[PDB]
């Protein structure tokens, strides 16, 4: 049902509410764009090149997880080759973290000051989020409260 | 007395070197909200003295043995790090 699997795909990406002619026109954009590439390298390596860029900017264990799944997905190759293409298109606690004070046999470390320095940035981002909200909540409504009479109002636009 | 001046002396009281003077490091003006937090912070430096006197009084006599050295010379690897923090 390859002629239908493109028809069901065009429904999901259609945002819910003419919804009867847009699907007819969006199926054109699906075909008008599918045959441009057709007119005109291993698989796991492309993940590692993205695994590297993970570890550099921190978040090591997540990168050790991305490789943990592709190792069990072996025991389909063309599917992961599609996900690596859309890697950047997406939209933008645990106390048993470092916590040298809990464990069975925790090894000697001495002060770190590189875990407490990335434990105050975990808090500084919190106070900087709940402050942009109050900057994006008093702005979205004062831009309407003070304007020309009848701009932001939809009933006056009739 | 500015808050910055207190931050200047405290970074010394963490070592033993004394506004803040020398068993609590009695500070001697400024507001009560400042003296209280200095008191607790200054006292941490006092501890550093008690651990320094031992590794200096017993590093003098030669009749402490062979174990009493590996102890008095393992209280120093746990002090260089405390000297790296004061650096930062």
């Amino acid at each position: 049902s390859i002629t239908q699997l493109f028809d069901d795909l065009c429904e999901a990406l259609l945002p819910a509410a003419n919804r009867k002619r847009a699907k007819r026109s969006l199926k054109k954009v699906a075909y008008n764009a599918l045959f441009t590439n057709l007119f005109q390298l291993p698989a796991r390596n492309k993940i590692l090149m993205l695994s590297f860029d993970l570890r550099v900017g921190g978040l090591g264990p997540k990168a050790d997880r991305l490789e943990e799944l592709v190792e069990e997905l072996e025991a389909v190759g063309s599917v992961l080759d599609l996900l690596v293409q859309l890697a950047g298109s997406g939209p933008p606690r645990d106390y048993f973290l470092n916590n040298k004070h809990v464990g069975r046999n925790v090894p000697y470390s001495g002060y770190d000051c590189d875990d407490l320095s990335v434990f105050e940035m975990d808090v500084q981002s919190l106070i900087s989020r709940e402050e942009c909200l109050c900057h994006s909540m008093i702005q979205e409504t004062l831009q309407v409260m003070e304007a020309a009479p009848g701009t932001g109002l939809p009933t006056v636009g009739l | 007395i500015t808050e910055a001046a207190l931050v200047r002396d405290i970074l010394y009281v963490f070592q033993g070197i004394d506004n803040i003077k020398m068993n609590c490091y009695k500070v001697e003006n400024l507001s009560r909200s400042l003296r209280d937090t200095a008191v607790r912070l200054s006292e941490l430096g006092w501890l550093h003295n008690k651990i320094r006197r031992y590794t200096d009084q017993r590093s003098l006599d030669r009749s402490f043995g062979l174990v009493g050295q590996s102890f008095c010379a393992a209280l120093h690897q746990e002090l260089r790090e405390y000297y790296r923090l004061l650096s930062v």
Partner: peptide, 15 residues
């Protein structure tokens, strides 16, 4: 090689 000159640690600074 703990007797001879080694590079500085960078831990003394607040990296």
């Amino acid at each position: 090689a703990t007797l001879f000159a080694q590079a500085l640690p960078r831990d003394a600074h607040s990296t």
